[PDB]
Design a protein around this motif. Structure first.
Motif, PDB file in Angstrom:
ATOM      1  N   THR A 128      -7.206   0.908  19.883  1.00 38.66           N
ATOM      2  CA  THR A 128      -6.622   1.038  18.513  1.00 38.66           C
ATOM      3  C   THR A 128      -7.725   1.138  17.450  1.00 38.66           C
ATOM      4  O   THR A 128      -7.400   1.479  16.286  1.00 38.66           O
ATOM      5  CB  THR A 128      -5.663  -0.129  18.252  1.00 38.66           C
ATOM      6  N   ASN A 129      -8.974   0.858  17.827  1.00 42.27           N
ATOM      7  CA  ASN A 129     -10.159   0.861  16.928  1.00 42.27           C
ATOM      8  C   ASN A 129      -9.978  -0.180  15.814  1.00 42.27           C
ATOM      9  O   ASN A 129     -10.272   0.136  14.617  1.00 42.27           O
ATOM     10  CB  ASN A 129     -10.441   2.254  16.372  1.00 42.27           C
ATOM     11  N   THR A 130      -9.513  -1.376  16.181  1.00 36.56           N
ATOM     12  CA  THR A 130      -9.233  -2.492  15.244  1.00 36.56           C
ATOM     13  C   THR A 130     -10.138  -3.686  15.575  1.00 36.56           C
ATOM     14  O   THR A 130     -10.611  -3.794  16.758  1.00 36.56           O
ATOM     15  CB  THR A 130      -7.737  -2.834  15.263  1.00 36.56           C
ATOM     16  N   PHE A 131     -10.336  -4.563  14.583  1.00 41.18           N
ATOM     17  CA  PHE A 131     -11.193  -5.776  14.638  1.00 41.18           C
ATOM     18  C   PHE A 131     -10.403  -7.003  14.182  1.00 41.18           C
ATOM     19  O   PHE A 131      -9.708  -6.945  13.122  1.00 41.18           O
ATOM     20  CB  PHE A 131     -12.451  -5.580  13.785  1.00 41.18           C
ATOM     21  N   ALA A 132     -10.536  -8.104  14.917  1.00 44.39           N
ATOM     22  CA  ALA A 132      -9.806  -9.367  14.646  1.00 44.39           C
ATOM     23  C   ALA A 132     -10.452 -10.094  13.463  1.00 44.39           C
ATOM     24  O   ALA A 132     -11.713 -10.192  13.387  1.00 44.39           O
ATOM     25  CB  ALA A 132      -9.772 -10.239  15.872  1.00 44.39           C
ATOM     26  N   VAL A 149      -8.190  -1.757  11.109  1.00 45.78           N
ATOM     27  CA  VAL A 149      -9.198  -0.656  11.106  1.00 45.78           C
ATOM     28  C   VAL A 149     -10.218  -0.940  10.004  1.00 45.78           C
ATOM     29  O   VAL A 149      -9.829  -1.556   8.975  1.00 45.78           O
ATOM     30  CB  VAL A 149      -8.553   0.734  10.934  1.00 45.78           C
ATOM     31  N   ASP A 150     -11.468  -0.514  10.211  1.00 47.55           N
ATOM     32  CA  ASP A 150     -12.532  -0.559   9.175  1.00 47.55           C
ATOM     33  C   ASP A 150     -12.111   0.338   8.007  1.00 47.55           C
ATOM     34  O   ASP A 150     -11.689   1.491   8.239  1.00 47.55           O
ATOM     35  CB  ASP A 150     -13.901  -0.166   9.738  1.00 47.55           C
ATOM     36  N   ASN A 151     -12.170  -0.218   6.801  1.00 45.84           N
ATOM     37  CA  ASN A 151     -11.931   0.473   5.513  1.00 45.84           C
ATOM     38  C   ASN A 151     -12.745  -0.259   4.463  1.00 45.84           C
ATOM     39  O   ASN A 151     -13.031  -1.443   4.634  1.00 45.84           O
ATOM     40  CB  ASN A 151     -10.449   0.485   5.139  1.00 45.84           C
ATOM     41  N   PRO A 152     -13.110   0.400   3.340  1.00 43.99           N
ATOM     42  CA  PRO A 152     -13.674  -0.323   2.206  1.00 43.99           C
ATOM     43  C   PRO A 152     -12.630  -1.388   1.826  1.00 43.99           C
ATOM     44  O   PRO A 152     -11.446  -1.058   1.795  1.00 43.99           O
ATOM     45  CB  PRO A 152     -13.903   0.766   1.142  1.00 43.99           C
ATOM     46  N   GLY A 153     -13.055  -2.644   1.668  1.00 46.79           N
ATOM     47  CA  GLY A 153     -12.170  -3.736   1.226  1.00 46.79           C
ATOM     48  C   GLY A 153     -11.209  -4.210   2.304  1.00 46.79           C
ATOM     49  O   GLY A 153     -10.357  -5.063   1.977  1.00 46.79           O
ATOM     50  N   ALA A 154     -11.334  -3.746   3.559  1.00 43.22           N
ATOM     51  CA  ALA A 154     -10.717  -4.432   4.716  1.00 43.22           C
ATOM     52  C   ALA A 154     -11.351  -5.817   4.779  1.00 43.22           C
ATOM     53  O   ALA A 154     -12.519  -5.991   4.393  1.00 43.22           O
ATOM     54  CB  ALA A 154     -10.895  -3.663   6.004  1.00 43.22           C
TER      55      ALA A 154
END
Lengths: 416, 416
Positions: A128-132, A149-154
């Motif tokens: 899913t390309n996600t981080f806990a 998912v990695d995003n600015p302000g994630a």
């Protein structure tokens, strides 16, 4: 020399580097459960069964303690010490969350560690390309663990281990020992070593994660505490199939039962999700539960992967032997045995060992020394399957002290 | 002590059990090539570059000889002895064919052996659920090799090995040996063992398939014949970083360069598609070519998988030392080195070994014996990355014969 990462040989807590005192906590909550500290919105209400909390870490509380089981593909199955359930990525109501579920396995239970530096890592769901991390970056608040998912302000997904437990009941692995030839017989009354007396060589041994060991006595929530790994031993010994005194020129007939019984294979499959394939006594077939660990199991147990779609079974051969010496002679006949033994971390045996008798590798002991019996004839009485229906080319001289292994020159199909 | 299937340690031909004399043959043909013996239709015309033929087997002809490289997932990459290209499933003009292509790898180069009995097998492409056999069951005719789904009409896909080559230049693996402590110094003039002189421990060694070894001298067509496997050794030794005679109370400054340089990592990546991760000197990162073999490589080399997204680099520390003895003293300072060495089957070295100097494990030798130097101060001059920016807590006494390993008690971040 244990080739496991440090995360696989201890329990550890998991925390945001930005949280003062909170760590990931196993919950038994249902949808609708309220995280009281959270700001309103998707972080305040549970959307799945068994979400994880951002909980004030309690020293010695098993709900915060995780072991990382290393897969062949360099990912991990992450199990908790409270109930042995594993972490899983899940989408519920369009929210990516971390939940705990029974080991299946499935790709959503596989996590990648990404080490950023010495003491900082991220937990990656590669599918899913996600981080806990902690919902809406509420790092010091009671709320759920998400995977985003990695995003600015994630929310920052940099993690650390807050506390470790290193006293976890790791097994003490047996030492490897070679298979010795059997002693020579000392007199006519010496029948040689019976199977109960024969020394075992330890040819290989491997750790087995407790998640898929169906221990008849220990439920999962107790296995993860007392025996987070089991030990599978690959042992060999010389197995006496018969012994008798023969008069000069005496002819006798024996029924030789070799292989492994269907009931033993079913027991091995139920216990550890492995069977012995029909292609050899050291050839392993893996099911869905054991497959993710198969190359480690093969490498450490000193076995090989099976290519057969059939399990090793039993075969009964009728053997006619002739004492071609003009002496009274004691003969003792042995085949090589493969013995698979499963123990808990405390060294206790989980059941009866699984034994394959290999008809293809055979030894003889005589008294007096250096006598030879003639194998006049071999016939198959019955076999559980048609995978290997080779028999010895007869007549064949069996000599004291000489190991014979089947090859293309000394065997033939049974109807030739 | 070699844990490989028999198909991986020999070359063998592949033939239909229904063919008198024909075996699978590597061709360098193009589309429109005519199979003269074939009946008219899809079996008579080549549809792809480098189809395989059903060829009259010629003893000692490399175009019929294949080695099966064993993947961690129990599938095989099947390479030919003529040019080292591998088998691949391909659809061209709606026909499922077997072709030969350079190792990529891709899922269509992965084959499953399905053993039906002792001497009979099928070659399964699991992605497409197809089995390799002779076009339109023309088992005694010059025609192409196809890969087709099981269906009532389908040509029988039962195969055997017609001939073997067992003399293939397998390497002789070195024995494992432990790392000995360095000898004591014998006099003031004794600088201890230089890096060229220090004995190497062999901690691990693994076979590497020749397919992705970019040997600077041997092209693929010659590697598959002379060195079908290479050997990667994991060696360790004690590496002298400096030695000097100090007068009583003398202060000196050294620039200590540790780690591994970017040029060595790039060379290792080009040669074998492996680099050393920043998380440790024994931590391997795998690229696309080496990944399918990673668990075997780790298990046999006695290394660990890396979790870092950066390679190990160099670091330059400025070290201030003080001879706190009122004697003239010889000091020799050592760090542990990890040395990765690649050899061909004939034992010849492929290039310069790749060396990681581990700044975290350090020893001292003195003359006279049992002297101690003071480490007054350590500062980082520069580092290639920010993965490890710990330094020694100073002042620190370094004593003759005492190995010091970094831990949380004797180290700190560089800005504290």
């Amino acid at each position: 020399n244990l080739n496991l990462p440090e995360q696989s040989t201890r329990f550890q807590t998991i925390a945001s580097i930005h949280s003062n005192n909170c760590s990931f906590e196993i919950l038994n909550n249902d949808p609708g459960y309220i995280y009281g500290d959270s700001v309103d919105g998707e972080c305040r209400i549970a959307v799945a069964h068994r979400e994880l909390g951002n909980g004030l870490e309690r020293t010695g509380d098993d709900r915060f303690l995780f072991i990382f089981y290393a897969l062949d593909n360099n990912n991990f199955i992450i199990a908790n010490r409270h109930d042995g359930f594993v972490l899983q990525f899940l989408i519920a109501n369009g929210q990516g969350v971390i939940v705990s579920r029974e080991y299946q396995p499935n790709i959503h239970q596989e996590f990648t560690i990404q080490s950023i530096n010495s003491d900082t890592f991220r937990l990656h769901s590669r599918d899913t390309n996600t981080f806990a991390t902690v919902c809406w970056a509420q790092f010091n608040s009671w709320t759920k663990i998400v995977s985003r998912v990695d995003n600015p302000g994630a929310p920052n997904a940099n993690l650390k281990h807050r506390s470790l437990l290193t006293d976890i009941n790791m097994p003490q692995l047996p030492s490897l020992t070679p298979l010795q030839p059997l002693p020579r017989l000392t007199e006519l009354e010496d029948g040689g070593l019976s199977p109960a007396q024969a020394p075992r060589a330890i040819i290989g041994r491997t750790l087995i994660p407790c998640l898929f060991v169906n221990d008849p006595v220990l439920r999962l929530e107790n296995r993860i505490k007392q025996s987070p790994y089991y030990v599978l031993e690959h042992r060999q010994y010389w197995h006496r199939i018969w012994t008798d005194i023969f008069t000069a020129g005496e002819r006798r007939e024996y029924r030789e039962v070799t292989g492994i019984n269907n009931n033993a294979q079913n027991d091995m499959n139920k216990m550890i999700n492995i069977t012995i394939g029909a292609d050899g006594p050291n050839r392993l077939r893996f099911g869905n539960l054991s497959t993710p660990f198969r190359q480690q199991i093969i490498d450490n147990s000193n076995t090989l992967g099976s290519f057969a779609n059939t399990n090793y079974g039993t075969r009964t051969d009728i053997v006619n032997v002739f004492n071609s010496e003009f002496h009274q002679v004691r003969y003792a006949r042995f085949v090589k045995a493969y013995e698979y033994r499963l123990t808990r971390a405390d060294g206790s045996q989980v059941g009866t060992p699984w034994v394959v008798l290999d008809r293809k590798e055979m030894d003889l002991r005589t008294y007096p020394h250096n006598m030879a019996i003639t194998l006049e004839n071999v016939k198959i009485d019955n076999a559980d399957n048609s995978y290997d229906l080779s028999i010895w080319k007869t007549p064949l001289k069996l000599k004291d002290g000489k190991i014979i292994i089947e090859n293309h020159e000394n065997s033939k199909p049974y109807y030739n």
